[model samples]
Target: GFSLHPPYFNLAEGARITASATCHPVSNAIDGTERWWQSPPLSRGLEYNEVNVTLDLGQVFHVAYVLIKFANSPRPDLWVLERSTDFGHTYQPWQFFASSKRDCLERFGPRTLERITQDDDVICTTEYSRIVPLENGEIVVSLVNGRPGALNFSYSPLLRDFTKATNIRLRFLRTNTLLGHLMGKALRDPTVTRRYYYSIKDISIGGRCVCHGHADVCDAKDPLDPFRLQCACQHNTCGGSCDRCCPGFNQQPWKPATTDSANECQSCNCHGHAYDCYYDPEVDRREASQNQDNVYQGGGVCLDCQHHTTGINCERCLPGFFRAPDQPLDSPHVCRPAAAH
Candidate 1:
């Protein structure tokens, strides 16, 4: 069970950004520790703000509900909600959970009231609701909004029979100002509050389960089949179970070097070009040495031309030219015929 902070305006004038905050268990209080999981601080010339969190579903999970709270701000005050089932890699629209202007004024004491109960106001009084299927899968939630001078907010989602989640991220989108104020407050304070709560219970196998018993337990396990137990790659690119491959090796049937184990993978190389092979460590070492000498090299060719040779490798010269005075061993004097010169 993890949480995130809200986007806010920075102190620097003309810069709007996300606010940093601390995170701690709500029931069992923890010491103030800085949490920077909120949207990145807003800067000038940026587009929007967003944040994402991933949850893994090794076992089965029955999601209950999600609760969110918005902090006070001076801008229009709005936020967008999104989620991704495939970890935090991709996301889609969850819903538009908005805050009411009237509610914002009442809760946080409005400063220069704009509009009340209008469709445009960001903060809302009623808690947003959504019911979706969780099929042994993870979910990623994201918050995106572009309201100038907005502050921090809180949110909590309840779940049942939870397992694990990974690779959560949040992106902050600042509107008018460059530095976000909410981001400043979070940076200054190093504590996160668990304003949201979730409740979980054990599930019974043979007997009736809690909540929707049939829907929760009956369909929990995948159909008992030999194929079900066997590992099958989602894309079916691999004939056998999809195993982790090497960093440079791709898992494609057409690739001759594809292997189940990353360590057993073959080197990637372009046909007919020894320099094209992906495992060439010499290229890296050579380039590093050349760079140290304030020289640049390209395609294993030295770029610091000397003497009469003017090409990248210093291997050739003009038809009618003589060697320059300062020639090095790596680079030699190549003088054209005097008659041609």
Candidate 2:
């Protein structure tokens, strides 16, 4: 199997948590301790006060779901979970949450919990929006929960692209409180708004390290450098995510594994006369013309051919030498001088 022994885990375990405004330290959310991250109080009764918490997972991953646990306050009245695939440079909405349908329509422009038609369609739901269970309420969001393409995930390019992310952000649009509208207590006392703040116990992102299905584990960098991750590549591949083929094994272009195919890199057919080879577009065009099906095609060009061999794959004798009649092309003595023949 191309997947890790345990395919999924909490990606936020080693992540860097940051917040737009935090009463408590943002590191508490990912510190694996009992402490939590708390947002600053709403100064003027929730007027244009939107707080955000973001987690940088250090490397791209196939994110499956996100779980947020609240500590002191009730759940948010309106919120959105977004993901960034390009290391927080940009973000796309994953899901929207609201305590009421009216809020969902006003904030996100008319969305429902209806089954999404596409893999990347963002929908709003009231499932985790309740103000009850005031303490220790948790929000569980599965990225592929209602996705149609999840059944054939390996074959779904849209879903594959949708799940890759390097950072996850949670934006709290409005706060939920039972005392705000009760007999106009919120308007009478400005101090009441101080109690209405966002406090999060933890933020857990469930996923696996991104290796494009070529690695089961990722290795850590040296202590001297800033902490980073690199996949322990397998199947003759290399790169941070096993994104390319090794130097001498480029007979075919690199491809990630699928459910049915490993797509392992192929060694160049250099006929034992060359130690180095590389992919050549000219060679591929010629090979493609000879084999339309592309099953037996090879595009690697041998470099610095030895043993008096000079052809593309070291399969021919040099201009001054003739091939021995009964010898194999790969044989060291296969090419003989004209006088020796």
Candidate 3:
């Protein structure tokens, strides 16, 4: 399918036209020759136009380059080319490939540059440029201008890697006579410079990909699976499941009733639980020494009491009152109860 932009002469009254055709494979028994037959006549006629075609590269023979050609009768012709590497998700900047005057003269002859003077009036007519490529492969070509003359454009790439790529899109910004008027007389006035913009017109792929040989192919077994490969254990088999042991704890397997594994594990008994549970030895020693000093000074172990009361040095009950026997470590031991004589 293709779309077209209206002609510039009468923009409001112009119409945009589109056309498309499909092909079917046919074999002739008489000559044993195979050919493709068009399903219907190709459509045409419009002020503006755009077209697109989809193809499957897997069943196709090696594809060569693709070409697009465009012509513009209007002067000061300019065209741009854009490319996309990722299935048309984005496009590169429009590369200025050809100018109307430059391409027209090169194709038909220098007539485009010929001087046409009328009634002592000098008119240097400008012509649109033609775009073509040197090779073939995957490419998209677009035509932006088509006035009195025909506009053609083409795309060609050196190679096609279909395994990694799937689709190509071409966007055309054709500015014939209709588009010229949209931009005002500036585009139509021969005395003024006319800038015509065209974009990628066609897309083609290089070739289909083979599974095993292609890097993009997906495989069933995941290559990153840990169980599928060997992993080294830091501690060699002392016959113990060392992986289960915490750092600094003996690598002993857990026993059902006892809950401690003696064989494979090391004992890290700092807090009397496991070697891994031990407090820093230096911290433990400092605390023990401090406790001894407190005891020697007849200061009772200030254990189980509130901050306000210290040691057996609990010389006397605090100002609040006498201590109660039933109080737990953190509970209120002294109270403002009825005054006791």
Candidate 4:
């Protein structure tokens, strides 16, 4: 039912992407917009030449396929998609959604070659039955693109679904050049040299995220799962489902939709003396505030103070410790045992 709406998780949506060239509003590939990415244009409004885009998932992840819808223009002649796990230190070929053939033929007046077939009545396609392992350290999964009639549609597995899973650290995809331009009367003779501008209506990278060995972590995934897992954490070490300390520490929740999450939860400034506390999903929920008539306070954090320290912040001297006359402000009460005096 939802086939028209693919579960393509726009990998570039929240990814840190860098493009070799991208025009402003018209071509910011990772802007999470339909805004297409285009190389610089010449005088005639046609974008000539090639460009590349790289994406860093911050951490290694699995990548399925790259989706790119053309902007009523020409298709690039060559597409090279690559991936890297060593922070771009090395790259491996990762061209997942490659167009093996182009069936349309175009004419010169400014219009591109019309597609030979448009009725969704696909004629030739090799239906993929199984995953064939080749000699190279690569496995090939079959993909299908079929449409039986104007209404009924059939297809092979999605490009990403059949691909292998690896720690896809960095991804780089590029087009060599856009050929075939609208020159005057003379340029259309050679079929190979005929080129057109390249523009994209949308660019999306599809994939699913798997949780590594962490307490609990999450990222946006395609092929929706409404009952997604959650963070069952400890240490007040919130988020990441497993990354931070309790109230006294700061942590970045590993939830996706944002990359620079709050930094790994840092320890709270307990003056280095207080021990951190954890909630048993705990609650002293009651009107426990005193001193003033209206306000109540009993629900404190897990940072229970240690030693003979008192006061909510453990800055004041308790039963034995005491603050002397010119106590320094930099450190908390240097209160030693009153009996020692």
Best by TM-score: 2
Alpha carbon lDDT of each predicted model: 0.26, 0.79, 0.27, 0.38
* Candidate 4 lDDT over residue span 45-102, tens digit each: 2333455656665444445455555553444434444566576666654332222333
What are the per-residue Cα lDDT tens digits for candidate 1 across 1-341?
11111122111111112223222222111111221122223332122232322222221122222223212111112333333345445554333332444543454445425433322232332232221211111122212232221122111121111211111112222221213334543343322111111111111111111211111112222555311122232221233222332332221112211122222333232211112112224554444222213343312323334444443233456456755447433334445446531
Q: Write the residue-wise lDDT of candidate 2 on 132-167 in tens digits.
A: 877898998988877888997877788888888988
Candidate 1 Cα misplacement greater than 4 A, ranges: 1-36, 51-60, 69-76, 86-90, 98-341
Assess candidate 1 and give its lDDT. Answer: 0.26
Q: What would the per-residue lDDT of candidate 3 be over residues 1-341, giving only the tens digit for each residue?
A: 12111111111011111223222321110111232212221122222222322222211122122233221222113333333345445543322323455554453345434442211111123323322221121223212222111222111111222112222222332333234244443334432223322222222232222211112221214456411211121222111112243344322232211112122323332111111322233433333312222322111122233434432223234565645567532343432344657
Q: Lowest summed lDDT over 10 consecutive residues: which window, candidate 1?
A: 197-206
Best by lDDT: 2
How many Å off is the CA of 220 in candidate 3?
19
Prediction 4 TM-score vs. true: 0.36
**Residue 317 accuracy (lDDT) in model 4:** 67
Q: List runs of model 4 lying over 4 Å from the truth.
A: 1-9, 25-27, 42-48, 96-195, 212-341
